Design a binder for these strands. Structure first.
Lengths: 143, 45, 115, 101
RNA sequence: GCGACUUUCUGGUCUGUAACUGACGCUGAUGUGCGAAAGCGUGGGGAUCAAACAGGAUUAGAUACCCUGGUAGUCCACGCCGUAAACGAUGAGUGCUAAGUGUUAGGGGGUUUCCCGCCCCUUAGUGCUGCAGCUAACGCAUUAAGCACUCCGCCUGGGGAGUACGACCGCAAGGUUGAAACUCAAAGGAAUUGACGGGGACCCGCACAAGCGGUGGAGCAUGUGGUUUAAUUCGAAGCAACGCG
């Protein structure tokens, strides 16, 4: 029922990057997932010369909602969403909104996206909003 | 008065009378026998 | 443009609706706010949050002329009559009292039956 | 639909007859993807008429069953079971809404 | 059946008093009178509620269940029918039969400075528990379904049917009285096990939620049915058969 720790990421001595790899680590092929990710580092750390952790913590905090809802007939309730599910939420809307960009390369759409929400743009900041629109539209009939 | 009790006091004097049951009792009509029996089957609850 | 700062309010939170009407000392109409007039319907009027925006509106629209203190009077047995007043106190008013009211008959007449 | 029948060669008047009389129930709701029927003959020595059938459902399935002398009376039974079945299954359900808080 | 207030009339009830008459009582066929609600009549009166009904929605359908309005009525008097789960599903009167428990109107007694606090006993009424005893069982159990007495009404398998003919009453709806043919071998009461549930409560489950991945979508192998054959050999079919035998 507990949740499958990552020790650290041995890149950056971080943790979050591994939590993201495991969502990108298709086929268990971390070699190719950490490939495409390291490519992501040098590329985005080139464009707008900065770090991952800046655009990373920035953009991961720019899409991350603080609310979302749930049904229970089905009545949809507002709740302050819990944090780790909120983490994997930002991760998931991030990547799943990412691949639909209609763009060829492994990485360019990704950095395009984190750079998108880095300036409070992008459809994941948008879904954050609509979550925060239904929420407080969802206060009347459920709170 | 400010705030806080202003909503709790009123609620206290409102809970005493019991507006809820008084006019909820008269929400839908009943027979006299039925009503009588109902009232009887209770006095100290 | 009648202006005082101690008007009075009449309220009614029915099972299916919860509305407002703000009147003067005597009093007489100045404004009212229907939950239905805020797009809602159905039970969506009956929800407490409907009375928030409503009472905020006619409270606001009424203190257009200028009114802060007030007395309150609440029939209409329903939900909104204790939340949307916690929205009312935020509305720009200085409530001096709140008086319960409800039409008690004395075995007067019949209600309906079904079910 | 699926119709395998042992110790007998099926015919066609029974097909239009039985399956049309089953089609009458689109009053509720038909919903007609599968309808598996089943038969056999069985010496007693009065010696049989097996009339067995499924009439499966959306998210669930069913069973009606009968043995008879004869297929007409014996069939009016695979029908006038399923009727009452489908009827209930739709009544049900639970709407008597009711605000809360 | 009777619950705003007051007055006018007005019957009845319980206590103690027992001094008065001194067995005058009990039951009660026939009989005569009261009598829910519906209802009929003559008029009046008519705010709500409302069969019928108009319309709306839902359902496959709904003349129904739900919403809106809506008549007769619901209301007053004068009348009339006179019935009912009119049920405590128990006729009335009398007398004895273990306790406990509230509660009502009263009386008497003690207790405290004075009972206002308290208790004791008793009378009538009133409900709860609970022994013998009774009862097919359930239950009853001093307000008996116990024990015994007096009187009245009723019953004799069920369906036929409280229907029919006839008679009485009634404006009419109908009431009362109340059969037989034929038919059946049971109908039925109480209590137990199991079954069911669109009844309830508790728990578990990839049954949910959550999520990931899948099929169906296009091309390839293969089982089944349908086809066909001279042969397409035979079997097994919701899960539990269709990459099986």
């Amino acid at each position: 029922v507990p949740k499958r720790d990552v020790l650290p990421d041995p890149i950056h001595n971080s943790k979050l990057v591994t939590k993201l790899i495991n969502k990108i680590m298709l086929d268990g092929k971390r070699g190719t997932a950490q490939r495409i990710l390291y490519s992501a580092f040098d590329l985005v750390e080139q464009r707008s010369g900065r770090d991952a952790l800046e655009v990373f913590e920035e953009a991961i905090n720019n899409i991350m909602p603080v609310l979302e809802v749930k049904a229970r007939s089905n009545y949809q309730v507002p709740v302050e969403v819990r944090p780790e599910r909120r983490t994997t939420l930002g991760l998931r809307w991030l990547v799943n909104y990412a691949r639909l960009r209609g763009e060829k390369t492994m990485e360019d759409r990704l950095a395009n996206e984190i750079l998108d929400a880095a300036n409070n743009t992008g459809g994941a900041v948008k879904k954050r909003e609509d979550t925060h629109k239904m929420a407080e539209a969802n206060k009347a009939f459920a709170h | 008065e400010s705030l806080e009790d202003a909503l709790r006091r009123f609620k206290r004097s409102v809970s005493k009378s019991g507006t809820i049951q008084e006019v909820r009792k008269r929400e839908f009509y009943e027979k006299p026998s039925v009503k009588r029996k109902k009232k009887s089957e209770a006095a100290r609850k | 443009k009648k202006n005082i700062e101690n008007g009075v309010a009449h309220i009614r939170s029915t099972f299916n609706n919860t509305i407002v009407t703000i009147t003067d000392e005597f009093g007489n109409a100045l404004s009212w706010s229907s939950a239905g007039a805020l797009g809602f319907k159905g039970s969506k009027k009956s929800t407490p949050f409907a009375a928030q925006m409503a009472s905020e509106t006619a409270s606001k629209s009424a203190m257009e002329h200028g009114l802060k203190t007030v007395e309150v009077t609440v029939k209409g047995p329903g939900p909104g009559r204790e939340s949307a007043i916690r929205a009312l106190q935020s509305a720009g008013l200085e409530v001096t009292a709140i008086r319960d009211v409800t039409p008690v008959p004395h075995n007067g007449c019949r209600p309906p039956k079904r079910r | 639909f699926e119709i395998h029948g042992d110790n007998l060669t099926i015919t066609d008047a029974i097909r239009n007859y039985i399956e049309e009389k089953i089609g009458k129930l689109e009053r509720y709701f038909n919903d007609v993807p599968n309808a598996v029927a089943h038969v056999k003959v069985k010496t007693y020595s009065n010696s049989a008429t097996k009339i067995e059938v499924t009439i499966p459902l959306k998210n669930v399935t069913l069973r009606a069953e009968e043995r008879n002398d004869d297929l007409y009376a014996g069939i009016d039974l695979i029908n006038n079971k399923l009727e009452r079945q489908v009827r209930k299954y739709k009544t049900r359900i639970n709407r008597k809404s009711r605000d809360r808080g």
